[PDB]
Design a protein around this ligand. Sequence first.
Ligand SMILES: Cc1ccc(CCc2c3nc[nH]c3cc3c(=O)[nH]c(N)nc23)cc1
Ligand SMILES: Cc1ccc(CCc2c3nc[nH]c3cc3c(=O)[nH]c(N)nc23)cc1
Ligand SMILES: [Zn+2]
Ligand SMILES: [Zn+2]
Lengths: 359, 359
Amino acid sequence: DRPRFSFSIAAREGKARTGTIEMKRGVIRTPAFMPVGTAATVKALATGADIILGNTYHLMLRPGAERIAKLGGLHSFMGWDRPILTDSGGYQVMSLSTKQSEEGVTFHMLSPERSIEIQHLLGSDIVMAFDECTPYPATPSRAASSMERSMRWAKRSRDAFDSRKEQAENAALFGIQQGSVFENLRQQSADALAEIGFDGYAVGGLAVGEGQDEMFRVLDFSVPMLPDDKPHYLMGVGKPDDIVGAVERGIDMFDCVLPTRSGRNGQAFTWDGPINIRNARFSEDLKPLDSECHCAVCQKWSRAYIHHLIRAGEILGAMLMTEHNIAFYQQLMQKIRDSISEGRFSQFAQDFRARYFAR
Amino acid sequence: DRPRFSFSIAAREGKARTGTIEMKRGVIRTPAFMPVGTAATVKALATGADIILGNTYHLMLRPGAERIAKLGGLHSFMGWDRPILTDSGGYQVMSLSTKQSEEGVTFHMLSPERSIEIQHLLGSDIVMAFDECTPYPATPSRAASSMERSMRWAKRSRDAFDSRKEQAENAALFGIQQGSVFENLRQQSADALAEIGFDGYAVGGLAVGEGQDEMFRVLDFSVPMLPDDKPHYLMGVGKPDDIVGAVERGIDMFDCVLPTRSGRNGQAFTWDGPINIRNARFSEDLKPLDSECHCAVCQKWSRAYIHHLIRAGEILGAMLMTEHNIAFYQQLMQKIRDSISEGRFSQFAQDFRARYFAR
Ligand SMILES: Cc1ccc(CCc2c3nc[nH]c3cc3c(=O)[nH]c(N)nc23)cc1
Ligand SMILES: Cc1ccc(CCc2c3nc[nH]c3cc3c(=O)[nH]c(N)nc23)cc1
Ligand SMILES: [Zn+2]
Ligand SMILES: [Zn+2]
C-alpha cells in the first residue's frame, strides 16, 4: 500500500514548493492547511482537509490519553480515518497551565518520553518532538540555552519514538527548530535536527508576538537551513497573508487556529479581507460572506442572515461562520498549490495582497 | 398548482388522525413537528421538516418586520422555500417583555391588526390569530374575561387577514382556543372561533405550568369541540410523551422548542428516555446517542465523542446534539403517522411509553 512516509515535490517557484506527502492513512497535498478536528465536522478534502489536528494538551487532561486509547484512538474517537497531527504539548503547557527541568515539565509530568507515548496512545500519524517554545523577546544567551535543551529533547523524542514498534513503523516524527530570532542559533538548531534525522522539520518559536515583518525576516534565513527534500511546517501561523508570505519563503504546512476561533467571535475571512459579521453594516447585505467562495454556506445564505443568527445568540451562526472560514482557507491553499504548479504563484501573491489589503 | 389550503385525513384510529395539509409552498404530513428554523440547518423532510417556525416576537424587534420584508421575506432570508408558520406575538410579549387594553398590548404596540401585518411582512404561510394566553392558574371569571377578549381579537385578526389580498389568497389563518381549564369556556371559545371561521384551530393556553395530567384532561374535552375536518395545533407542546398523548386526543400539529433548547444544555432524546450527555457515565460510551436513530450524528459519532465536545465547550457538540434531537422528533412523528395509517397506533403508544419510562 502507501508508504509510512514519502514527500515528493511536484513543482517549484522561487522558494515555494507544491507536492504531496504520502502516508498509510492518506495523501496530503502541500502547501497544506491542517484544521483542528473538533471545531466543525471536517470532511475529506471545502469544509474539509487532508489532515486534521488533535489537541494533545487538552486530550491528556480530558479524558486522558489512556482513555482515548481505550476508546480506539483518536481516529475512531473523532470518526476520521485520514492522517492526524498532534503537537507535543510543550507549547500549550507553558502557555495555558509550571516547573521546568532537564527531565521535562511538571504542571502531571511532561517529558520527551511521556509526550511521545501520549501521542502514541492517541494514535496520531504525524508526531511532533517535545520542545520548548522560547518566549519572545529573548536574549541571545537565553535563546541559546533554550534551543540547546530543545535539541537534547529532540534526541530523546527520536529515541522514544523509535522504541515503540507500532509508532516507528506507521507514524512519522517531525523535529522542531528553535533559536528565537537569531540566525546563528537557528543554524545550530537545524544542524542538530538534521544530524538526529526526522521525517519533517517544523519552524518553532514564531507566532509568539514578534509581528509579521520580523517573522518573515526570520523565515528568510531559517527555512533554507532545513533539509530541502523534507516538508517544512510553520507552527502557529496564521492569517491568510501570513500563509502566502510563508509559502513564498518555503513553508509547506500550516495549522492556523484563527479561522476556527474567529468564527465564534463574528470574524469571517474573505478575498477582500476579514469582516466582522456582527457589524450593523451587514444587517441588510444580501451578498454571501464571500462572492467567490464555493462553500455550502455561501451557496445558500446571506451575510444578513448570518449577522442575524450571531446577533441573536444562535449557535448556528457561529457554526456557519466556522464552516465558511475553514472552507476559505482550503480554497486559499488550493489556489496556492495550483498557482505554484502553473508557475504563476508570484503573480497570485501580488494579486492576493492588493485585493486583501484594499478593503 | 396546489391550493391555498387543504386538509385531508387519510386514516384514523380512535381520536388520532393522520393526513396532509396542502399549501402553495408544499405538503405537510400530519401529525407534524414544526421546528424553529434558526436552531440548525433544517432540510426538506431526518434533521428536516415539512414546515418550520419563524419567531415573530424576536423578528419584529431584530431586524424588524419591515426590514425582513425589504430583504425578500423570511423564505428568502432563511433560504427555506417550503411553508412557514409564525405565532402572533401575544404569548411572547407577555412572557418575555407590558400594558394591555382592548386595543392591544404596548411594551412598540401589538394589536390584532399589527400582528397580522407583521406576519404579512414576514411572508409566513400559516398565520396565527392575535390572542391572549391566559395565565395559569386563573379563576373562572378571569379566564372568561380573557377568553372573551381573545375572541374579539380573533374576529379582528380574521378581518385584518382578509383585507390584505396577497395574504388572503396565499396564506392561511388559524384561530386559537382559550378558556384555561374550564370546559364551558373552552366550548364558548370553540363556538366563537367556528362562527368566525378559520383554516385551522389551535389549542392555546396550555403548556403554562399545568402539568401533563391536567393538560391531557383539558385536551380530552377541548379537542372534540373544534371542527373535526380542520387541523388541530397544540401550541407549546412538548416532550415526546406529550406528543404521543396529544395525538391520542386528536392533535395534528406541534411546535416543541424543547428539542432545540435541550441540545445546548446537553440533553438528548432517545427511545429510552432523555439523557444528559455531559454526565460522566457517557465518557467511555461508544454507542450512538440512540441505537436506532437514523440521523447523520448517530450514523457517525459516539456518545463519548459528543460528551467530550460539549464538556470541552465546543459549539460543534451542541450543534450535533440539536441535529440529533430534531431528527429524533421527526422520526417519532413518522412512526406516529405510519402506526395510525396501519391501525397500530394504540399499540405503538403503549410500547413507546413502556420503553421511554423504563430507562
Ligand atoms: C491544536 C494546536 C494547534 C496549534 C499548536 C501549535 C503550538 C505552537 C505555536 N503556536 C504559536 N507559536 C507556536 C510555536 C510552537 C513551538 O515552537 N513548539 C510547539 N510544540 N508548538 C508551537 C498546537 C496545538
Ligand atoms: C418560535 C415559537 C415557538 C412556540 C410558540 C408558541 C407560544 C405559545 C405557547 N407556548 C406555550 N404555551 C403556549 C400557548 C400559546 C397561546 O395560548 N397562544 C399563543 N399565541 N402562543 C402560545 C411561539 C413561538
Ligand atoms: Zn463561504
Ligand atoms: Zn441521532
